[PDB]
Amino acid sequence: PLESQYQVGPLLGSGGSGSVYSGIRVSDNLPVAIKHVEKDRISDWGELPNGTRVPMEVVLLKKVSSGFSGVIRLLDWFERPDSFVLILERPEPVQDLFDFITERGALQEELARSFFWQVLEAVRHCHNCGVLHRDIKDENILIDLNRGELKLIDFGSGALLKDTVYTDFDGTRVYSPPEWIRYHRYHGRSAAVWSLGILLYDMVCGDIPFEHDEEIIRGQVFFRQRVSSECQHLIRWCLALRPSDRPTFEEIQNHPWMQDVLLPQETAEIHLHS
């Protein structure tokens, strides 16, 4: 072991995330991303389907890791004195949905439907694996511009999925459901549907619908862009004040607006010039 194995490129970003660097597996030049998370700053630990102390992020990543390209793969990880180092895949070329939206503005419905569909499949995948992501949002989605495939990233606020209530949250507040803001409780799935509601609004209008606590609590959605009535209908549904008034993933995917999505390949051809 040890990082004579990878060649550390430029810093790609930093935050509550820690710091992510571009990398190249020296073995075969596979593009990779090297995430460093400091121990002091990690609140949630778990332990491996073998038993040694790791951050939950790595548990979660290990549970979702597979052939499915809809969630970033964990390639490997190391422990250091005050940090863990995660080696993740890196699509190339790549752009995060935030930058993409910053740069191209409100997305056309055709494009948002394909992107949104792929997010749905990704999140469903996580749920099939027992992992709840807890921070679904445009900065946590990567676009593989060549294949037109979205990848979900950053499980550093995830949890194991369960059917009982959550009384802790450390995702993004502006994407968090009203029940979180008032009572500090939420159930997982329905809280994801709320953030998917925010996400689809973000895509189709170019920005999140709510900045403030009272706007979330109120949950009146105003539309700043031209958006089809069906789209609005689905957005408003996801953003129902009462959790159980929200659609299941199956109801979302069978919604009229989600009909006849482009394959990811056709998506890149049409909308990404690839």
Complex with ligand 79O: residue 88 or 112, whichever CB lies closer = 88
Active-site option among 96, 135, 144, 154: 135
Cα–Cα distance measured from residue 150 to residue 143, given in angstroms and rounded to the nearest whole number? 5
Cβ 65 to ligand 79O, closest distance in Å? Answer: 13
Q: Are strands 149-152 and 11-15 parallel, antiparallel or unpaired?
A: unpaired
Query: Is the bond into 55 cis (omega within 30 degrees of 0)?
Result: no
User: Rounded CA gap, 197 and 256, in Å?
Assistant: 15
17 binds ligand 79O (CB under 6 A): yes
List binders of ligand 79O among 141-170 (CB under 6 A).
153-154
- According to the binding rule CB under 6 A, does residue 179 interact with ligand 79O? no
Residue 135 bears catalytic tag: yes
With binding defined as CB under 6 A, does residue 102 bind ligand 79O?
no
Q: Is 97 an interacting residue with respect to ligand 79O (CB under 6 A)? A: no
Q: Which two tokens stand for residue 63?
A: 């549970």
Q: Which stretch binds ligand 79O (CB under 6 A): 9-17, 117-125, 196-204, 207-215?
A: 9-17
Q: Nearest Cα to 247, choosing from 257, 235, 230?
A: 235
93: contact with ligand 79O by CB under 6 A: no
Q: Which is nearer to ligand 79O, 170 or 230 (CB)?
A: 170
Least distance (Å) between residue 35 CB and ligand 79O: 5
Q: Rule CB under 6 A: say whether 15 interacts with ligand 79O.
A: yes
Quick note: the x/- pattern for ligand 79O over 39-78, rule CB under 6 A, is ---------------------------------x------
Binding site for ligand 79O (CB under 6 A): 12-15, 17, 19-20, 33, 35, 72, 88, 90, 94, 139, 153-154
| Catalytic residue annotation | 135
